[PDB]
Design an enzyme around this catalytic site. Structure first.
Site, short mmCIF file in Angstrom:
data_model
loop_
_atom_site.label_atom_id
_atom_site.label_comp_id
_atom_site.label_asym_id
_atom_site.label_seq_id
_atom_site.Cartn_x
_atom_site.Cartn_y
_atom_site.Cartn_z
N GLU A 52 20.44 -0.93 -7.52
CA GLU A 52 19.86 -1.64 -6.42
C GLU A 52 20.07 -3.15 -6.80
O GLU A 52 20.05 -3.59 -8.08
CB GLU A 52 18.27 -1.32 -6.77
CG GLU A 52 17.52 0.24 -6.64
CD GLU A 52 17.59 0.60 -7.97
OE1 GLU A 52 18.16 0.24 -8.96
OE2 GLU A 52 17.22 2.04 -7.84
N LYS A 149 -8.03 15.73 6.93
CA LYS A 149 -7.04 16.93 6.91
C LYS A 149 -7.56 17.90 5.90
O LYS A 149 -7.35 19.25 6.26
CB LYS A 149 -5.71 16.48 6.51
CG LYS A 149 -5.26 15.17 7.31
CD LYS A 149 -3.85 14.71 7.16
CE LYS A 149 -3.31 13.94 8.44
NZ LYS A 149 -2.86 12.49 7.92
N1 LIG Z 1 9.46 2.12 -1.54
C1 LIG Z 1 9.72 1.93 -2.64
N2 LIG Z 1 9.66 3.17 -3.25
C2 LIG Z 1 10.15 3.14 -4.74
N3 LIG Z 1 10.29 2.17 -5.36
C3 LIG Z 1 10.35 0.95 -4.82
C4 LIG Z 1 9.85 1.03 -3.44
N4 LIG Z 1 9.66 -0.51 -3.08
C5 LIG Z 1 10.03 -0.97 -4.11
N5 LIG Z 1 10.24 -0.29 -5.13
C6 LIG Z 1 11.09 -0.60 -6.46
O1 LIG Z 1 12.46 -0.54 -6.29
C7 LIG Z 1 13.03 0.61 -7.21
C8 LIG Z 1 13.65 1.49 -6.69
O2 LIG Z 1 14.47 2.19 -7.62
P1 LIG Z 1 14.52 3.87 -7.43
O3 LIG Z 1 15.72 4.36 -6.63
O4 LIG Z 1 13.37 4.18 -6.37
C9 LIG Z 1 14.49 4.64 -8.92
P2 LIG Z 1 14.21 3.61 -10.57
O5 LIG Z 1 12.67 3.56 -10.66
O6 LIG Z 1 15.13 2.22 -10.22
O7 LIG Z 1 14.96 4.58 -11.59
P3 LIG Z 1 16.22 5.62 -11.59
O8 LIG Z 1 17.29 4.70 -10.88
O9 LIG Z 1 16.70 5.62 -13.08
O10 LIG Z 1 15.91 6.78 -10.85
C10 LIG Z 1 11.71 1.00 -8.19
O11 LIG Z 1 11.83 1.30 -9.59
C11 LIG Z 1 10.52 -0.10 -7.67
O12 LIG Z 1 10.41 -0.95 -8.74
N1 LIG Z 2 3.06 8.49 9.09
C1 LIG Z 2 2.55 9.30 9.90
N2 LIG Z 2 1.92 10.47 9.74
C2 LIG Z 2 1.14 11.20 10.70
N3 LIG Z 2 1.38 11.14 12.01
C3 LIG Z 2 2.11 9.94 12.26
C4 LIG Z 2 2.54 8.89 11.31
N4 LIG Z 2 3.09 8.19 12.13
C5 LIG Z 2 2.85 8.32 13.54
N5 LIG Z 2 2.34 9.42 13.52
C6 LIG Z 2 1.62 10.18 14.84
O1 LIG Z 2 0.44 9.69 15.12
C7 LIG Z 2 -0.47 10.50 15.12
C8 LIG Z 2 -1.54 10.24 13.97
O2 LIG Z 2 -1.85 11.65 13.18
P1 LIG Z 2 -2.95 11.72 11.97
O3 LIG Z 2 -4.07 10.63 12.29
O4 LIG Z 2 -2.31 11.58 10.69
C9 LIG Z 2 -3.67 13.51 12.14
P2 LIG Z 2 -3.34 14.38 13.59
O5 LIG Z 2 -1.96 14.52 13.98
O6 LIG Z 2 -3.68 13.33 14.75
O7 LIG Z 2 -4.08 15.63 13.56
P3 LIG Z 2 -5.72 15.71 12.83
O8 LIG Z 2 -6.41 14.53 12.93
O9 LIG Z 2 -6.37 16.89 13.57
O10 LIG Z 2 -5.46 16.30 11.49
C10 LIG Z 2 0.18 11.99 14.55
O11 LIG Z 2 -0.19 13.17 15.47
C11 LIG Z 2 1.61 11.45 14.83
O12 LIG Z 2 2.24 12.01 16.17
MG LIG Z 3 17.53 2.65 -9.88
#
Ligand SMILES: Nc1ncnc2c1ncn2[C@@H]1O[C@H](COP(=O)(O)CP(=O)(O)OP(=O)(O)O)[C@@H](O)[C@H]1O
Ligand SMILES: Nc1ncnc2c1ncn2[C@@H]1O[C@H](COP(=O)(O)CP(=O)(O)OP(=O)(O)O)[C@@H](O)[C@H]1O
Ligand SMILES: [Mg+2]
Ligand SMILES: NC[C@H]1O[C@H](O[C@H]2[C@H](O)[C@@H](O[C@H]3O[C@H](CO)[C@@H](O)[C@H](N)[C@H]3O)[C@H](N)C[C@@H]2N)[C@H](O)[C@@H](O)[C@@H]1O
Ligand SMILES: NC[C@H]1O[C@H](O[C@H]2[C@H](O)[C@@H](O[C@H]3O[C@H](CO)[C@@H](O)[C@H](N)[C@H]3O)[C@H](N)C[C@@H]2N)[C@H](O)[C@@H](O)[C@@H]1O
Ligand SMILES: [Mg+2]
EC number: 2.7.7.-
Lengths: 253, 253
Positions: A52, A149
């Site tokens: 990255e 949920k």
């Molecule tokens: N949504 C997201 N999820 C995960 N990491 C996130 C992220 N936003 C930022 N990051 C950062 O970006 C990095 C993403 O690298 P990753 O592909 O998730 C694995 P890594 O931790 O670098 O180790 P690896 O390459 O040995 O598996 C993380 O280490 C974290 O510091």
């Molecule tokens: N990240 C996300 N997770 C879940 N639903 C998402 C979502 N982003 C958008 N949505 C939409 O927005 C709605 C919000 O859903 P939630 O509040 O998480 C539970 P629900 O599906 O309404 O049923 P429930 O409240 O009876 O458990 C979902 O039904 C889906 O169609």
């Molecule tokens: Mg990495």
């Protein structure tokens, strides 16, 4: 494709340098700095690791990234304006402990004027309030919801979702911890292992992580209680810590 | 905080209208349409389910929200200028199948001029190419990414992340199918069950989902081994459907 191949830090790095050279040929004077983040930037990169990188553009309103594979390996390069990056680095959110560790792990490859420290510092100087607000939001917007949920699952099923919810929940608490403690997790994989070590851990937390970490998420009766206990370990924790959510208003606006 | 309590459609519906009124008194003529989504919207709502609303506005700069609790209940209102939202209705991402169901599940409570249909027409008036690119991106940005991870795990750890990783993968492949079959999930808990009901499944998924849905995630060896096959299932499938990405360039820019 055959997927990710085994490579060496040394191989990885040549790539880093190859790409670096390309960024500069292409943008030139528009490039302010370039960095390696992640396992590589940490120098803890594993055999199947990815690359990255983050690049700092002079150019305004700039926000783009380039992610690819060659079938053997994968790369990801994010480009930003010096502004866009700062603002971003200044954002505490529900997954801050997950996302923002990237700003304390940069491995500098090219800096035309210390842009990379600037970044780090900024990340480093977050107001305490910010973290509070973020805990609060996480509760209303997240924990609460899962709570719902999981209580319905009991009620009307399905438990086929129980194993997945728990994980989400296990994670949620970890971000809770981290926001509390102003920690960022190393990688995504170390998250559970590092969270479960911190100090002021909510009652019921470790026990849940047990389940989630061992893989024994088959008994929904148990998982149901843990979530339950955890949630209660939480109501408390919040009080004692001061992250008290504003329930009062039936109509917030 | 007692967490979500037991409610009924009546109760729910009652608030919806109360909410409906504040919006109308609050924004008045700037309110183009107010609607309900979620479990409520379809009326598939449950004892501990929450409230989701969405409102359209004439305001240009519209894209804000309000989420809150009272301690026993949650509400979530989303405000958007029709332009912004419409625009978002037609946006196919890796998680469009979880997400876009919203645009279908509408329960119209107020609407000055069928805006809530435009949005629906729009959501369902999305191009196959668009979905074609979605798939390609997932694979790269994600699938491929999860592959190294589970690989590294096989070699250096840690297993405490295996369970959790697998769930991630399973969710994603599900995203795959939906994007594949212009499908959207009702709700989050139905994702899996529903997905595995599809036809064109990549070789491996089903089995893989069985572990996630069951919670029998304790077996490491067996997982990695069920993951790899999935990966290979993908490799085939994409070649079959034409979800092919050019990997010829080492540095594609
Ligand atoms: N949504 C997201 N999820 C995960 N990491 C996130 C992220 N936003 C930022 N990051 C950062 O970006 C990095 C993403 O690298 P990753 O592909 O998730 C694995 P890594 O931790 O670098 O180790 P690896 O390459 O040995 O598996 C993380 O280490 C974290 O510091
Ligand atoms: N990240 C996300 N997770 C879940 N639903 C998402 C979502 N982003 C958008 N949505 C939409 O927005 C709605 C919000 O859903 P939630 O509040 O998480 C539970 P629900 O599906 O309404 O049923 P429930 O409240 O009876 O458990 C979902 O039904 C889906 O169609
Ligand atoms: Mg990495
Ligand atoms: N209907 C979609 C959902 O959108 C928001 O939810 C929250 C997101 O989910 C959060 O993301 C966190 O949780 C995700 C899983 O949800 C994880 O992938 C992610 N890494 C986490 O940081 C994000 N930070 C804030 C946001 N408020 C709504 O508030 C919630 O009501 C609703 O259900
Ligand atoms: N290091 C963070 C990751 O950032 C991007 O990846 C993607 C996000 O992760 C996706 O979000 C997915 O994962 C979430 C968390 O599980 C789920 O909530 C959600 N339903 C999924 O769609 C999103 N849709 C597209 C985006 N390109 C990079 O491409 C990738 O290199 C890197 O790994
Ligand atoms: Mg709902």
């Amino acid at each position: 494709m055959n997927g990710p191949i085994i490579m060496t830090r040394e191989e990885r790095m040549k790539i880093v340098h190859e790409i670096k050279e390309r960024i500069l040929d292409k943008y030139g004077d528009d490039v302010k700095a370039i960095g390696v983040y992640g396992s590589l930037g940490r120098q803890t990169d594993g055999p199947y690791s990815d690359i990255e990188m983050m690049c700092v553009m002079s150019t305004e309103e700039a926000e783009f990234s380039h992610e690819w594979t060659t079938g053997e390996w994968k790369v990801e390069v994010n480009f930003y304006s010096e502004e866009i990056l700062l603002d971003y680095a200044s954002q505490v959110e529900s997954d801050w402990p997950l996302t923002h560790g990237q700003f304390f792990s940069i491995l500098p490859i090219y800096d035309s004027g210390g842009y990379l420290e600037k970044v780090y510092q900024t990340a480093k100087s977050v107001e305490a309030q910010t973290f509070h607000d973020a805990i609060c939001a996480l509760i209303v917007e997240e924990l609460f919801e899962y709570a719902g949920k999981w209580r319905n699952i009991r009620v009307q099923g399905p438990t086929t979702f129980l194993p997945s919810l728990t994980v989400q929940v296990a994670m949620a608490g970890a971000m809770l911890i981290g926001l509390h403690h102003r920690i960022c997790y190393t990688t995504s994989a170390s998250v559970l292992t590092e969270a479960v070590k911190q100090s002021d851990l909510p009652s019921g937390y470790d026990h849940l992580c047990q389940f989630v970490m061992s893989g024994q998420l088959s008994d929904s009766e148990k998982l149901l209680e843990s979530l339950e206990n955890f949630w209660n370990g939480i109501q408390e924790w919040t009080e004692r810590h001061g992250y008290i959510v504003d329930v009062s208003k039936r109509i917030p606006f």
